[PDB]
């Protein structure tokens, strides 16, 4: 239902400008393997050292989850991390330079595939099938954030989803469908972004929602 989707033209121009940066510059995508947390501030966070992010001049990473339960699942275990980080409003240890990411965490041990798993993305624009594409992961269990981000990056490149000076795409959504039909599909609205900075934009990923990479495919619906 197109009238349940938010409109690009209702997004403040400054916000579209900041979203464009997030989905144009690959440097915002953190992709770290076999790390381990060694500190914690709030009970729903874990802190990792020696994660060097050149563009923000930070050395530590705080991952924020929506529960103490999630943090407890991952604190002090070998983990992979994938997602979009932020530096502004990020609080770390007092004498450290820290960036922040919501969720994006998978157990490392036993989750590494012997080769890239390919996930199909079908794209429709005003109901007409467009050129499809794939995204890839090396993880058996993969965060939705990783899949969503890889798709959104490609959509920004091909369709200028978030560009402040384009207006030919006004609405859109991304659906995650189980191949075997055993899980209820779900979607995100591309133009339904919370707040005005990264600390707010990506907070919804704090659920650390995770799927089987073998069992999902993606459909994107775009509308003029």
Residue numbers in the entry: 27 to 250
Text taken from the publication that reported this structure:
Superantigens (SAgs) are the critical virulence factors of Staphylococcus aureus. SAgs can cross-bridge the major histocompatibility complex class II (MHC II) with T cell receptor (TCR) molecules to stimulate a massive proliferation of T cells (~20–30%) in a relatively nonspecific manner. The multiple X-ray structures of staphylococcal SAgs revealed that the protein is composed of an N-terminal oligonucleotide-binding (OB) fold and a C-terminal β-grasp domain. SEN belongs to the group III SAg as revealed by multiple amino acid sequence alignment.
The structure of SEN was solved by molecular replacement, and the final model was refined at 1.8 Å resolution (Rwork = 0.171, Rfree = 0.201). There is one monomer per asymmetric unit. Overall, SEN is a compact molecule and shows the classic two-domain architecture of SAg proteins. The N-terminal OB-fold domain (residues 52–137) consists of five-stranded β-barrel (β1, β2, β3, β4, β5a, and β5b) and two 310 helices (310 1 and 310 2). The C-terminal β-grasp domain of SEN consists of anti-paralleled β-strands (β6–β12) and α-helices (α4 and α5). Superposition of SEN and other SAg structures revealed that in the SEN structure, an asparagine (Asn44) is situated in a nearly identical position to that in the other SAgs. However, the aromatic pair is not present in the equivalent position in SEN. The corresponding amino acids in the position are Gly113 and Asn114. These amino acid variations might confer TRBV specificity to SEN. The ion-coordinating amino acids and their stabilizing amino acids are present in the structure of SEN.
